[PDB]
A paper describes a structure:
Free fatty acid receptors 1 to 4 (FFA1 to FFA4) are class A G protein–coupled receptors (GPCRs). However, FFA1 and FFA4 are activated by long-chain fatty acids, while FFA2 and FFA3 respond to short-chain fatty acids generated by intestinal microbiota. FFA1, FFA2, and FFA4 are potential drug targets for metabolic and inflammatory conditions. Here, we determined the active structures of FFA1 and FFA4 bound to docosahexaenoic acid, FFA4 bound to the synthetic agonist TUG-891, and butyrate-bound FFA2, each complexed with an engineered heterotrimeric Gq protein (miniGq), by cryo–electron microscopy.
Author numbering:
A (entry chain B): 2 to 343
B (entry chain G): 6 to 62
Write the structure that this text describes.
């Protein structure tokens, strides 16, 4: 009689927040931006093909300079590419070949990797010895690493398969804050442009907006019918988009605390593996399992251009910091850089 | 039994999440549209820059 009334109160509170969201939803993004001019067909050409990996690519991250990118493959190697000239700056041999994520530090000095080894290894690119060596191996995650992002050169937030995200201090190696509340495995996270918040999508079809300093979830967003594979913050930091297994991308909003638009098409049945926003946030690029990579209209939900030429399931997607180009990596061990031409 | 503690912590989390100031969707959509329009000229994917300026030419 004690826990039953507690769960009844929880259900009542959930209904209360649901009706609050319904009341605050006077209109939708569909009718507000129906008069905006459509972007039309978007043609993207494979300017560069960063061949060199000998196994399926699972994650990549652009550098802050919009020229270098790290790509991680189940070959057991993290290769740093000079995307302008398709040159291999570094080839870091990972301790465990089961790597599911990688990151590039905002300063460019460090890169991170993680996966089934439960450890988010951090490598120091700029060393006096001239080679790249692992600096701190962050251990403490029970589940497999899914996505790691760098706050600064000393702070990194990681999402694991143990339903928990963690904020790490690289200098000490201990979790500064631990984020709890997810029911399913957390698959991706995206740092806000203002760096003071971050969202994380999990397998329980829910994306939770956390706070780095507060240490506990602030907002929870639902609506998906399957696992969430990817998440990205709209450039202004006031919204984010989710990629799920039910072949739909949803654009939630932090301030409105509810979804704004869904990006679904009857032709597409396969789930989304990676999502990323353009520099202005107008184009949302999503990577599907049908070997293709759509370019959705954020304000129109209109299929505008397809990055069809990848031969296999695209698993990672990244837009440059200046928005100059889009790099998509797939399971055919190929990274392709795409950008439009007049 | 740890079920009671889990229920209590979930109730507290919902209690915190409920007390959040939510703006109308009109203002949020207007802000998103304003941000998209302001940075449209600086987006090299929305408006493709000339091939002489593409680093990947």
């Amino acid at each position: 009689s004690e826990l039953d009334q507690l769960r009844q109160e929880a259900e009542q509170l959930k209904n209360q927040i649901r009706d609050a969201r319904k009341a605050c939803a006077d209109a939708t993004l569909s009718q507000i931006t129906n008069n905006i001019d459509p972007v039309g067909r978007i043609q993207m050409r494979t300017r560069r093909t960063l061949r060199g990996h000998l196994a399926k690519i699972y994650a990549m991250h652009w550098g802050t300079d919009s020229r270098l990118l790290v790509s991680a493959s189940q070959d057991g190697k993290l290769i740093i590419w000079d995307s302008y000239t398709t040159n291999k700056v570094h080839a870091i041999p990972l301790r465990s070949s089961w790597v599911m994520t990688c990151a590039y530090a905002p300063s460019g000095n460090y890169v991170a990797c993680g996966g089934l080894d439960n450890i988010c290894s951090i490598y120091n690119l700029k060393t006096r010895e001239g080679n790249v060596r692992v600096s701190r191996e962050l251990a403490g995650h029970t589940g497999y690493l899914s996505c790691c992002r760098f706050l600064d050169d000393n702070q990194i937030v990681t999402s694991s398969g143990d339903t928990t995200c963690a904020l790490w201090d690289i200098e000490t190696g201990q979790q500064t804050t631990t984020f709890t509340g997810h029911t399913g495995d957390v698959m991706s996270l995206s740092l806000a442009p203002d760096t003071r918040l971050f969202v994380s999508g999990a397998c329980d079809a829910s994306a939770k907006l956390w706070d780095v300093r507060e240490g506990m979830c602030r907002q929870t967003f639902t609506g998906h019918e399957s696992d969430i594979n990817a998440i990205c913050f709209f450039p202004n930091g006031n919204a984010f988009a989710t990629g799920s297994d039910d072949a739909t991308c949803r654009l939630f909003d932090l301030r409105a605390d509810q979804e704004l638009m869904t990006y679904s098409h009857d032709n597409i049945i396969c789930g989304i593996t990676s999502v990323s926003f353009s520099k202005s946030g107008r184009l949302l690029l999503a990577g599907y399992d049908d070997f293709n990579c759509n370019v959705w209209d954020a304000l129109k939900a209109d299929r505008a251009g397809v990055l069809a030429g990848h031969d296999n399931r695209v698993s990672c997607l990244g837009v440059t910091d200046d928005g100059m180009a889009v790099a998509t990596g797939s399971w055919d061990s190929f990274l392709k850089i795409w950008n439009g031409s007049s | 039994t740890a079920s009671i503690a889990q229920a209590r912590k979930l109730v507290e989390q919902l209690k915190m999440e409920a007390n959040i100031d939510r703006i109308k969707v009109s203002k949020a959509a207007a802000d998103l549209m304003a941000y998209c329009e302001a940075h449209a000229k600086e987006d090299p994917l929305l408006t493709p820059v000339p091939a002489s300026e593409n680093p990947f030419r």
